[PDB]
Design a protein around this nucleic acid. Structure first.
Ligand SMILES: [Mg+2]
Ligand SMILES: [Mg+2]
Ligand SMILES: [Mg+2]
Ligand SMILES: [Mg+2]
Ligand SMILES: [Mg+2]
Ligand SMILES: [Mg+2]
Ligand SMILES: [Mg+2]
Ligand SMILES: [Mg+2]
Ligand SMILES: [Mg+2]
Ligand SMILES: [Mg+2]
Ligand SMILES: [Mg+2]
Ligand SMILES: [Mg+2]
Ligand SMILES: [Mg+2]
Ligand SMILES: [Mg+2]
Ligand SMILES: [Mg+2]
Ligand SMILES: [Mg+2]
Ligand SMILES: [Mg+2]
Ligand SMILES: [Mg+2]
Ligand SMILES: [Mg+2]
Ligand SMILES: [Mg+2]
Ligand SMILES: [Mg+2]
Ligand SMILES: [Mg+2]
Ligand SMILES: [Mg+2]
Ligand SMILES: [Mg+2]
Ligand SMILES: [Mg+2]
Ligand SMILES: [Mg+2]
Ligand SMILES: [Mg+2]
Ligand SMILES: [Mg+2]
Ligand SMILES: [Mg+2]
Ligand SMILES: [Mg+2]
Ligand SMILES: [Mg+2]
Ligand SMILES: [Mg+2]
Ligand SMILES: [Mg+2]
Ligand SMILES: [Mg+2]
Ligand SMILES: [Mg+2]
Ligand SMILES: [Mg+2]
Ligand SMILES: [Mg+2]
Ligand SMILES: [Mg+2]
Ligand SMILES: [Mg+2]
Ligand SMILES: [Mg+2]
Ligand SMILES: [Mg+2]
Ligand SMILES: [Mg+2]
Ligand SMILES: [Mg+2]
Ligand SMILES: [Mg+2]
Ligand SMILES: [Mg+2]
Ligand SMILES: [Mg+2]
Ligand SMILES: [Mg+2]
Ligand SMILES: [Mg+2]
Ligand SMILES: [Mg+2]
Ligand SMILES: [Mg+2]
Ligand SMILES: [Mg+2]
Ligand SMILES: [Mg+2]
Ligand SMILES: [Mg+2]
Ligand SMILES: [Mg+2]
Ligand SMILES: [Mg+2]
Ligand SMILES: [Mg+2]
Ligand SMILES: [Mg+2]
Ligand SMILES: [Mg+2]
Ligand SMILES: [Mg+2]
Ligand SMILES: [Mg+2]
Ligand SMILES: [Mg+2]
Ligand SMILES: [Mg+2]
Ligand SMILES: [Mg+2]
Ligand SMILES: [Mg+2]
Ligand SMILES: [Mg+2]
Ligand SMILES: [Mg+2]
Ligand SMILES: [Mg+2]
Ligand SMILES: [Mg+2]
Ligand SMILES: [Mg+2]
Ligand SMILES: [Mg+2]
Ligand SMILES: [Mg+2]
Ligand SMILES: [Mg+2]
Ligand SMILES: [Mg+2]
Ligand SMILES: [Mg+2]
Ligand SMILES: [Mg+2]
Ligand SMILES: [Mg+2]
Ligand SMILES: [Mg+2]
Ligand SMILES: [Mg+2]
Ligand SMILES: [Mg+2]
Ligand SMILES: [Mg+2]
Ligand SMILES: [Mg+2]
Ligand SMILES: [Mg+2]
Ligand SMILES: [Mg+2]
Ligand SMILES: [Mg+2]
Ligand SMILES: [Mg+2]
Ligand SMILES: [Mg+2]
Ligand SMILES: [Mg+2]
Ligand SMILES: [Mg+2]
Ligand SMILES: [Mg+2]
Ligand SMILES: [Mg+2]
Ligand SMILES: [Mg+2]
Ligand SMILES: [Mg+2]
Ligand SMILES: [Mg+2]
Ligand SMILES: [Mg+2]
Ligand SMILES: [Mg+2]
Ligand SMILES: [Mg+2]
Ligand SMILES: [Mg+2]
Ligand SMILES: [Mg+2]
Ligand SMILES: [Mg+2]
Ligand SMILES: [Mg+2]
Ligand SMILES: [Mg+2]
Ligand SMILES: [Mg+2]
Ligand SMILES: [Mg+2]
Ligand SMILES: [Mg+2]
Ligand SMILES: [Mg+2]
Ligand SMILES: [Mg+2]
Ligand SMILES: [Mg+2]
Ligand SMILES: [Mg+2]
Ligand SMILES: [Mg+2]
Ligand SMILES: [Mg+2]
Ligand SMILES: [Mg+2]
Ligand SMILES: [Mg+2]
Ligand SMILES: [Mg+2]
Ligand SMILES: [Mg+2]
Ligand SMILES: [Mg+2]
Ligand SMILES: [Mg+2]
Ligand SMILES: [Mg+2]
Ligand SMILES: [Mg+2]
Ligand SMILES: [Mg+2]
Ligand SMILES: [Mg+2]
Ligand SMILES: [Mg+2]
Ligand SMILES: [Mg+2]
Ligand SMILES: [Mg+2]
Ligand SMILES: [Mg+2]
Ligand SMILES: [Mg+2]
Ligand SMILES: [Mg+2]
Ligand SMILES: [Mg+2]
Ligand SMILES: [Mg+2]
Ligand SMILES: [Mg+2]
Ligand SMILES: [Mg+2]
Ligand SMILES: [Mg+2]
Ligand SMILES: [Mg+2]
Ligand SMILES: [Mg+2]
Ligand SMILES: [Mg+2]
Ligand SMILES: [Mg+2]
Ligand SMILES: [Mg+2]
Ligand SMILES: [Mg+2]
Ligand SMILES: [Mg+2]
Ligand SMILES: [Mg+2]
Ligand SMILES: [Mg+2]
Ligand SMILES: [Mg+2]
Ligand SMILES: [Mg+2]
Ligand SMILES: [Mg+2]
Ligand SMILES: [Mg+2]
Ligand SMILES: [Mg+2]
Ligand SMILES: [Mg+2]
Ligand SMILES: [Mg+2]
Ligand SMILES: [Mg+2]
Ligand SMILES: [Mg+2]
Ligand SMILES: [Mg+2]
Ligand SMILES: [Mg+2]
Ligand SMILES: [Mg+2]
Ligand SMILES: [Mg+2]
Ligand SMILES: [Mg+2]
Ligand SMILES: [Mg+2]
Ligand SMILES: [Mg+2]
Ligand SMILES: [Mg+2]
Ligand SMILES: [Mg+2]
Ligand SMILES: [Mg+2]
Ligand SMILES: [Mg+2]
Ligand SMILES: [Mg+2]
Ligand SMILES: [Mg+2]
Ligand SMILES: [Mg+2]
Ligand SMILES: [Mg+2]
Ligand SMILES: [Mg+2]
Ligand SMILES: [Mg+2]
Ligand SMILES: [Mg+2]
Ligand SMILES: [Mg+2]
Ligand SMILES: [Mg+2]
Ligand SMILES: [Mg+2]
Ligand SMILES: [Mg+2]
Ligand SMILES: [Mg+2]
Ligand SMILES: [Mg+2]
Ligand SMILES: [Mg+2]
Ligand SMILES: [Mg+2]
Ligand SMILES: [Mg+2]
Ligand SMILES: [Mg+2]
Ligand SMILES: [Mg+2]
Ligand SMILES: [Mg+2]
Ligand SMILES: [Mg+2]
Ligand SMILES: [Mg+2]
Ligand SMILES: [Mg+2]
Ligand SMILES: [Mg+2]
Ligand SMILES: [Mg+2]
Ligand SMILES: [Mg+2]
Ligand SMILES: [Mg+2]
Ligand SMILES: [Mg+2]
Ligand SMILES: [Mg+2]
Ligand SMILES: [Mg+2]
Ligand SMILES: [Mg+2]
Ligand SMILES: [Mg+2]
Ligand SMILES: [Mg+2]
Ligand SMILES: [Mg+2]
Ligand SMILES: [Mg+2]
Ligand SMILES: [Mg+2]
Ligand SMILES: [Mg+2]
Ligand SMILES: [Mg+2]
Ligand SMILES: [Mg+2]
Ligand SMILES: [Mg+2]
Ligand SMILES: [Mg+2]
Ligand SMILES: [Mg+2]
Ligand SMILES: [Mg+2]
Ligand SMILES: [Mg+2]
Ligand SMILES: [Mg+2]
Ligand SMILES: [Mg+2]
Ligand SMILES: [Mg+2]
Ligand SMILES: [Mg+2]
Ligand SMILES: [Mg+2]
Ligand SMILES: [Zn+2]
Lengths: 59, 149, 53, 64
RNA sequence: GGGCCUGACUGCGAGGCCUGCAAGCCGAGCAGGGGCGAAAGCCGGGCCUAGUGAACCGGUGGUCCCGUGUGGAAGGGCCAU
RNA sequence: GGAUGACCCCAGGCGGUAGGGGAGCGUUCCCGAUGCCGAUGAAGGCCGACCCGCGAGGGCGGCUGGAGGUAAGGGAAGUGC
RNA sequence: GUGGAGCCUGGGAGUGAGGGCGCGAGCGAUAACGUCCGCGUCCGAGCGCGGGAACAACCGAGACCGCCAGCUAAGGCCCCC
RNA sequence: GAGGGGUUGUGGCGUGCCUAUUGAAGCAUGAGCCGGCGACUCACGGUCGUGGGCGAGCUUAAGCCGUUGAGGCGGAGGCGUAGGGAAACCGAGUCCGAACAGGGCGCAGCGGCCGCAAAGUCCGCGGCCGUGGACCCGAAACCGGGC
RNA sequence: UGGUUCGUGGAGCCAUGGGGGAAUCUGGGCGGACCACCGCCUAAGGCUAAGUACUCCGGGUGACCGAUAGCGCACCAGUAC
RNA sequence: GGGGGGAACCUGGGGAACUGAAACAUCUCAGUACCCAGAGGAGAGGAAAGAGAAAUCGACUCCCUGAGUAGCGGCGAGCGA
C-alpha cells in the first residue's frame, strides 16, 4: 500500500531529530501532504513524528 | 417444498421452434426457408463464413503475413507469462511462480514475469523476469525482486 | 512500361541499398540514371544510380 | 466433431483485443515501380476489416 | 522559353471523397535530409479525369528477426522490387 | 388509477405472401404415483341443438366399450397431414 | 413534427423471376398485354369490400369481431337494379 | 319442447383446394375416396441470447469410490486474469520510425469494511451457424465384389 | 516409393523394390538437410499376460416399440412368392 | 499336425468410386467400401539402435488431456500428429 502523510502540528519546540524526520519525509510546510511509500524506513520516521503528522493509508 | 413446487424460473426452459407444422404456426409449408433455391434445400448452402458465390473470397484476397512455421514445427523456447503487481496484492511474504499457478494467475509451463500494472507491496517476489517499471516499483515499495533462471 | 521503357531501381552509391523504383525510356536515356535521392540508411541525400530491376 | 480453425484466416488475419479483425492492406505484393511512396507506405500498414467481413472471419477462428 | 535542379522524397498523416466488400481518390500539417527562391513560399512527378490486375506460388536486393539439444548452416520471416 | 395482472377507465393500433417475434392447444413418455380415478365401468368408439375457451381444444351428458386411466405442477420428444 | 418515427449494438430472416398503370426518356415502327431505365403508384402480399356488364394492378377505399342502425366515396337514381 | 333441430321453395350473393407464378376458377401441377405411415433431428463444436452457480477467477476430463435410478472423489487440463509485434522482444503498453513526431492496435462499477451489481466462467434452455445423410422423397450415373 | 502432420518441401526419422556395400564398442543408429560440440540409444532373432475391441450366445435394465410400430419374421420367415 | 466354419471385433496382403474441392487433374472421400489370407476369445503391440531438450523420461496397449495445438495443404477444399 501507500501513505499520505500530512503535517498538522508544527515541529517548532520538538527535538532536532523529530525535525530531521520531517526533512527525511519531505515535509516542510504545515498541512503539506506527501503520498509516500509504505516501507519500514519511511514508516519509522512517520511513527517518530506521529504527533505532528496525520497519516492516510491510500493504496 | 415438494416435487410439484419444483419449477424453473420463467424463461429458463424455453420451448422449441417447430416448423413445417401447419398454417397457424407461422412456420407451415416452407418451414421458414423461403421458396426455392440452394438455401431451401436439405443440405443448404456452402459455408457462409467463407464461400461468396464463386468470386475470390474476401478472406482469400487478403495477403498472408508473418512466419507460419516449418516442419518439425514449433521451436521449443522459454515462454513468459506476465503477471501485474496488482495481482500480487493478495499475497503475503513470499510469492514464487508455484504460488501464482495455484492462485490461478500464472499458467503451468510458463516462466514468470512481473509487469508493473498496479501498486507494489513489500513482498518477496521470485520471478524469471521483471519489467522496467515493475522492478522500479517493487524496489521503491520495500520489495525483494528475486531474479530466477 | 514496355521493352523500351524499362522499370529500374535506384541504388544509393554509398551504402549500395536499392531505395527507389522508377522507370525510364532506355532509347531516350541509354546511360544509367544518376539522381540524388535521400537514402534512409545513410539518412542523407546521395548519388543514387540506376541498377537492374 | 469440434470445429477446425481455418488456417488461411489464421495466416492472414489477427483478432485484436476488442474483437476487431486486422489484416494487411492489399495491393503492394508486386507491380510497385509506378506506385507513389504514399501508396507503398500506406499499403504497408494494417487495416481493420469491414464489420460484416470481420464477423465472418472471426467465426473461422473459434479458438483464438 | 530559360537558369538552377531530382520532392518522379524517407518516416508519417489530421481530415475527408467514394463505397456492399476489397478497392479507388484528395490531403493540410509534423520530422529527416534536400531543391528552387532575396523572400513570401513552392516541391511527396506530370492541367485533370484512362494507360490496369486481389491473393497464392516463386525470383532478386536489403535486413540480421526465427534457426527444431547447443554454436553454425539449411530454410523461413520482415523491408524493397 | 391501485400499486407491481388484482381488475377498471380513457385513447390508439389490429388487410397481409416470404419472413421475424410472442402466447397457447393437443399427442407419446418420465417425476408427482407403494398415490389417485376405475366394473356403481378405464381407454377407445358413436352422438349432443349443453358448458368453458378467440382458437387449437377442454368439460359435461347419453349410447357403445369391457380394463385400464392418470391431476395440480414440472421434465423429455419418433408430437399434430 | 412523439411517429409500428429515428439512431446505436446484437440475434433471426426472407428477397435478389416482378407485373400493370401515370409521367420522363432510350430501343421498337411517334407497333406490341413489346422491351430497357428513371419518378410515382398500385397488384404482388389487399384474387377482401364498392364502381367499372363480367376483369390482379382504372376510379372509390386500407377488411379486429357483431348489429334486420346512420352518413358518405366512386358510380349511379326508366325497368333488369 | 316467444326456443331449437332437420329439410329446401323462392330471392340476394358467390370463379374448388394445393402448388407454381408477374398473374390461375382457370383449359397450368397434384389429388378417385377413406384410414393408417409420412419430412427441420441428434452428436460434437461455434455464436448469440436467456435461467441459475460462482467470480479474478470459473470449471473439471478420463478415471476412482460409493449407490444399484445416491452421490461423491478426481485440478490432469480448459477458458479468463494483457497487450502489441512477422518475430527477437518489450510490456500498460507495444508496433512502425532516427523521433522524446504522428499514427495503428491496446490500457481505467453501485450504495451505508459490508452488502448490490459485475469481468469472466460453469451448467441448463432457446435461436442460428459448422461437421456429419442434417428437412423428407427422387435421378440419370460412378465404383467394388459377385451372378 | 510408402508410412508419419509432413502433398519434394531446408525432408530428417521409420519401412523397402533396385544398385553399391561395411564394421563388432575406439563398434554403430538417433536428436528434422548438413558440420562440429553435447547427449540419447544399441539395428538387422524370437516370445510375452493384464488394461483395449466385438456381441452369434445368457442375463439384467429402459422418460425404448407396441402388430403399417418394434428385427425382414410376435404367427410353421429368410417361408410363400 | 493341417484342411473347414464362426455375428461383429482384430492383424496382415491388396484396394475403389460416387462425393468434396460449388467445374477439375494434385488434393478429398480413404487406406474407407470391398476382395483375400490369417488369428483368436480376443487380435495387434510390447521390454528402446525409443522419446527429445526436461541436465528429463523409461516396454506395450487403452481412455482422458495436450489439441483442432504443432504443422500439413492446387497454403484451396480441407488434412491433422
Ligand atoms: Mg507543535
Ligand atoms: Mg511548542
Ligand atoms: Mg536520535
Ligand atoms: Mg426442451
Ligand atoms: Mg432444437
Ligand atoms: Mg416461440
Ligand atoms: Mg409443438
Ligand atoms: Mg399450425
Ligand atoms: Mg414464430
Ligand atoms: Mg408468415
Ligand atoms: Mg402447402
Ligand atoms: Mg428463416
Ligand atoms: Mg428459424
Ligand atoms: Mg431458414
Ligand atoms: Mg418463388
Ligand atoms: Mg424466393
Ligand atoms: Mg415449394
Ligand atoms: Mg425463385
Ligand atoms: Mg431454385
Ligand atoms: Mg431462398
Ligand atoms: Mg437429401
Ligand atoms: Mg446441397
Ligand atoms: Mg471467376
Ligand atoms: Mg505458429
Ligand atoms: Mg517428429
Ligand atoms: Mg522483504
Ligand atoms: Mg492459408
Ligand atoms: Mg500486399
Ligand atoms: Mg513483397
Ligand atoms: Mg516477395
Ligand atoms: Mg505514374
Ligand atoms: Mg511518391
Ligand atoms: Mg517510388
Ligand atoms: Mg516503409
Ligand atoms: Mg486453445
Ligand atoms: Mg516551362
Ligand atoms: Mg526546360
Ligand atoms: Mg524548367
Ligand atoms: Mg546547386
Ligand atoms: Mg482517414
Ligand atoms: Mg471504403
Ligand atoms: Mg477508376
Ligand atoms: Mg529542409
Ligand atoms: Mg526548405
Ligand atoms: Mg522541409
Ligand atoms: Mg538560397
Ligand atoms: Mg525554405
Ligand atoms: Mg506536402
Ligand atoms: Mg497523366
Ligand atoms: Mg509541366
Ligand atoms: Mg497479387
Ligand atoms: Mg491457390
Ligand atoms: Mg514467398
Ligand atoms: Mg539469430
Ligand atoms: Mg543465434
Ligand atoms: Mg540448432
Ligand atoms: Mg565451432
Ligand atoms: Mg556462418
Ligand atoms: Mg539466411
Ligand atoms: Mg529473403
Ligand atoms: Mg514492398
Ligand atoms: Mg384497421
Ligand atoms: Mg395480422
Ligand atoms: Mg411479442
Ligand atoms: Mg395433437
Ligand atoms: Mg400441451
Ligand atoms: Mg417409457
Ligand atoms: Mg407410478
Ligand atoms: Mg398406477
Ligand atoms: Mg374407487
Ligand atoms: Mg356403464
Ligand atoms: Mg394411452
Ligand atoms: Mg367435443
Ligand atoms: Mg366411454
Ligand atoms: Mg356393457
Ligand atoms: Mg391390469
Ligand atoms: Mg402426467
Ligand atoms: Mg401437467
Ligand atoms: Mg419436478
Ligand atoms: Mg415424424
Ligand atoms: Mg412501420
Ligand atoms: Mg420499420
Ligand atoms: Mg429464428
Ligand atoms: Mg439469402
Ligand atoms: Mg431470393
Ligand atoms: Mg439472381
Ligand atoms: Mg422471367
Ligand atoms: Mg433480376
Ligand atoms: Mg424492372
Ligand atoms: Mg426485367
Ligand atoms: Mg418496384
Ligand atoms: Mg407505364
Ligand atoms: Mg393524362
Ligand atoms: Mg413513358
Ligand atoms: Mg433515355
Ligand atoms: Mg402509324
Ligand atoms: Mg411488360
Ligand atoms: Mg406500352
Ligand atoms: Mg413504350
Ligand atoms: Mg413499377
Ligand atoms: Mg411471389
Ligand atoms: Mg387495391
Ligand atoms: Mg399495399
Ligand atoms: Mg382489387
Ligand atoms: Mg383481384
Ligand atoms: Mg364480390
Ligand atoms: Mg364490379
Ligand atoms: Mg372490382
Ligand atoms: Mg356490376
Ligand atoms: Mg389485367
Ligand atoms: Mg344518405
Ligand atoms: Mg358522385
Ligand atoms: Mg346503368
Ligand atoms: Mg344524375
Ligand atoms: Mg329501382
Ligand atoms: Mg325453425
Ligand atoms: Mg329454414
Ligand atoms: Mg341460393
Ligand atoms: Mg333483394
Ligand atoms: Mg378471378
Ligand atoms: Mg387446404
Ligand atoms: Mg411450375
Ligand atoms: Mg410457369
Ligand atoms: Mg373451373
Ligand atoms: Mg377444369
Ligand atoms: Mg399441361
Ligand atoms: Mg386444374
Ligand atoms: Mg411445372
Ligand atoms: Mg400440387
Ligand atoms: Mg390412382
Ligand atoms: Mg367417395
Ligand atoms: Mg390420410
Ligand atoms: Mg434446427
Ligand atoms: Mg436423431
Ligand atoms: Mg444440435
Ligand atoms: Mg447454442
Ligand atoms: Mg449459456
Ligand atoms: Mg457454481
Ligand atoms: Mg433404490
Ligand atoms: Mg489467457
Ligand atoms: Mg501474439
Ligand atoms: Mg525496426
Ligand atoms: Mg501509441
Ligand atoms: Mg488510441
Ligand atoms: Mg453475482
Ligand atoms: Mg452468469
Ligand atoms: Mg448464425
Ligand atoms: Mg452422414
Ligand atoms: Mg439427416
Ligand atoms: Mg441442419
Ligand atoms: Mg444404365
Ligand atoms: Mg463418374
Ligand atoms: Mg465417368
Ligand atoms: Mg463409365
Ligand atoms: Mg467387376
Ligand atoms: Mg529412399
Ligand atoms: Mg517420402
Ligand atoms: Mg507421402
Ligand atoms: Mg514446404
Ligand atoms: Mg519427410
Ligand atoms: Mg532407412
Ligand atoms: Mg532396398
Ligand atoms: Mg560408441
Ligand atoms: Mg563409429
Ligand atoms: Mg537408422
Ligand atoms: Mg539414417
Ligand atoms: Mg543423424
Ligand atoms: Mg533421437
Ligand atoms: Mg539436430
Ligand atoms: Mg556421439
Ligand atoms: Mg535415443
Ligand atoms: Mg492374450
Ligand atoms: Mg497378469
Ligand atoms: Mg489384453
Ligand atoms: Mg466388454
Ligand atoms: Mg457398442
Ligand atoms: Mg440379450
Ligand atoms: Mg406406447
Ligand atoms: Mg406397453
Ligand atoms: Mg395387422
Ligand atoms: Mg411387422
Ligand atoms: Mg390393431
Ligand atoms: Mg426374432
Ligand atoms: Mg409380418
Ligand atoms: Mg408362410
Ligand atoms: Mg488353409
Ligand atoms: Mg484355405
Ligand atoms: Mg480356422
Ligand atoms: Mg491393410
Ligand atoms: Mg484391409
Ligand atoms: Mg481398382
Ligand atoms: Mg475423384
Ligand atoms: Mg463429403
Ligand atoms: Mg462441405
Ligand atoms: Mg464436385
Ligand atoms: Mg460441386
Ligand atoms: Mg461435371
Ligand atoms: Mg488417404
Ligand atoms: Mg465394414
Ligand atoms: Mg496374405
Ligand atoms: Mg479362417
Ligand atoms: Mg478379455
Ligand atoms: Mg499375441
Ligand atoms: Mg509379437
Ligand atoms: Mg533385448
Ligand atoms: Mg492449450
Ligand atoms: Mg483445447
Ligand atoms: Mg488422411
Ligand atoms: Zn545509403
Amino acid at each position: 500500500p501507500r501513505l499520505k502523510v500530512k503535517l498538522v502540528k508544527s515541529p517548532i519546540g520538538y527535538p532536532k531529530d523529530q525535525k530531521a524526520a520531517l526533512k527525511a519525509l519531505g515535509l516542510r510546510r504545515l498541512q503539506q501532504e506527501r503520498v509516500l511509500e509504505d516501507t519500514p524506513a519511511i514508516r519509522g520516521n512517520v511513527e517518530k513524528v506521529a504527533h505532528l503528522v496525520r497519516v492516510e493509508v491510500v493504496e | 417444498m415438494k416435487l410439484s413446487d419444483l419449477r424453473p424460473n420463467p424463461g429458463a426452459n424455453k420451448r422449441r421452434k417447430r416448423v413445417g407444422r401447419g398454417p397457424g404456426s407461422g412456420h407451415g409449408k416452407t418451414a421458414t426457408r423461403g421458396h426455392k433455391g440452394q438455401k431451401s434445400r436439405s443440405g443448404g448452402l456452402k459455408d457462409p463464413r467463407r464461400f461468396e458465390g464463386g468470386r475470390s473470397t474476401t478472406l482469400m484476397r487478403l495477403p498472408k503475413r508473418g512466419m507460419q512455421g516449418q516442419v518439425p514445427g514449433e521451436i521449443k523456447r522459454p515462454r513468459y507469462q506476465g503477471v501485474n503487481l496488482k495481482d500480487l496484492a493478495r499475497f503475503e511474504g513470499e510469492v514464487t511462480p508455484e504460488l501464482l499457478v495455484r492462485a490461478g494467475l500464472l499458467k503451468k509451463g510458463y516462466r514468470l514475469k512481473i509487469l508493473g500494472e498496479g501498486e507494489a507491496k513489500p513482498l518477496k517476489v521470485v520471478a524469471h523476469a521483471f519489467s522496467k517499471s515493475a522492478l522500479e516499483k517493487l524496489k521503491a515499495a520495500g520489495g525483494e525482486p528475486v531474479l530466477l533462471e | 512500361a514496355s521493352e523500351v521503357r524499362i522499370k529500374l531501381l535506384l541504388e544509393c552509391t554509398e551504402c549500395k541499398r536499392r531505395n527507389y523504383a522508377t522507370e525510364k525510356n532506355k532509347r531516350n536515356t541509354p546511360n544509367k540514371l544518376e539522381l540524388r535521392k535521400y537514402c534512409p540508411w545513410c539518412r542523407k541525400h546521395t548519388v543514387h544510380r540506376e541498377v537492374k530491376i | 466433431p469440434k470445429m477446425k480453425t481455418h488456417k488461411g484466416a489464421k495466416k492472414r488475419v489477427k483478432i485484436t483485443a476488442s474483437g476487431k479483425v486486422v489484416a494487411m492492406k492489399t495491393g503492394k505484393r508486386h507491380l510497385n515501380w509506378q506506385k507513389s511512396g504514399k501508396e507503398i507506405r500506406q499499403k504497408g500498414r494494417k487495416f481493420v476489416l469491414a464489420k460484416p467481413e470481420a464477423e465472418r472471419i472471426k467465426l473461422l477462428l473459434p479458438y483464438e
